[PDB]
């Protein structure tokens, strides 16, 4: 498609309200107000009001931004990257094409198009074919930092992150969670007034259990 088709669709969407946007959805959505804060989850038995754990499909989330664990081309592929591209529709590929790829540990922002999410932040996680090393640890932190820099610059008040570089990209689940949680905690300490929620999207039981154990450690007392 021609660049003015995605550019015009993007301008159309970005000036709409939630209520105008909602009228156009072809799927049921998950509004931010339906996801408990970790604070609500805990008094169910502070930065705990600013973080959530979510087990579902990231593409359902009506938030200012979802984070795509993309590949270097930004052209899509398999897993959730593929699910984000199908739910967003072909304007997402067209805008991504115009970005000319993305480096490891970097991020770029596009419109969300047909997603309930206003934007997609695309970030390229390190690939560990052997044991994680210093460079992989630094790049994974950089994915979170460069994503959160786009969150701050674009007045994104709600953002959902996947478990970047886990699975095929070879980052082990526990150490990846430590980097993700340290990076968001450090950023929240300086920027908490600028966001309503950071959501950790944790589909797999293995990731759900790891994050559940660590939320208090990073966000409590």
Curated annotation (Swiss-Prot):
Keywords: DNA damage, Hydrolase, Isopeptide bond, Nucleus, Ubl conjugation. One of its GO terms (biological process) is brain development. Changing residue 71 to A: Reduced ADP-ribosyl hydrolase activity. It is found in: Nucleus. One of its GO terms (cellular component) is nucleolus. There is a cross-link at residue 149 (Glycyl lysine isopeptide (Lys-Gly) (interchain with G-Cter in ubiquitin)). The keyword DNA damage applies. Subject to product inhibition by ADP-ribose. Its EC number is 3.5.1.-, 3.2.2.-. It is an enzyme of class 3 (hydrolase). GO terms for molecular function: ADP-ribosylglutamate hydrolase activity; deacetylase activity; hydrolase activity, acting on glycosyl bonds; O-acetyl-ADP-ribose deacetylase activity. Changing residue 81 to A: Reduced ADP-ribosyl hydrolase activity. Reduced ADP-ribosyl hydrolase activity. Changing residue 167 to E: Abolishes interaction with ADP-ribosylated proteins. Strongly reduced ADP-ribosyl hydrolase activity. Its main location: nucleus. It comes from the Eukaryota. It catalyses: 2''-O-acetyl-ADP-D-ribose + H2O = ADP-D-ribose + acetate + H(+); 4-O-(ADP-D-ribosyl)-L-aspartyl-[protein] + H2O = L-aspartyl-[protein] + ADP-D-ribose + H(+); 5-O-(ADP-D-ribosyl)-L-glutamyl-[protein] + H2O = L-glutamyl-[protein] + ADP-D-ribose + H(+); alpha-NAD(+) + H2O = ADP-D-ribose + nicotinamide + H(+). Substrate binds at residues 56-58, 69-71, 76-81, 164-170, 203. Residues 46-219 form the Macro domain. Belongs to the MacroD-type family. MacroD1/2-like subfamily. Interacts with ADP-ribosylated PARP1. Removes ADP-ribose from aspartate and glutamate residues in proteins bearing a single ADP-ribose moiety. Inactive towards proteins bearing poly-ADP-ribose. Deacetylates O-acetyl-ADP ribose, a signaling molecule generated by the deacetylation of acetylated lysine residues in histones and other proteins. This is ADP-ribose glycohydrolase MACROD2. It comes from Homo sapiens. The lineage of its organism: Eukaryota, Metazoa, Chordata, Craniata, Vertebrata. The gene is MACROD2.
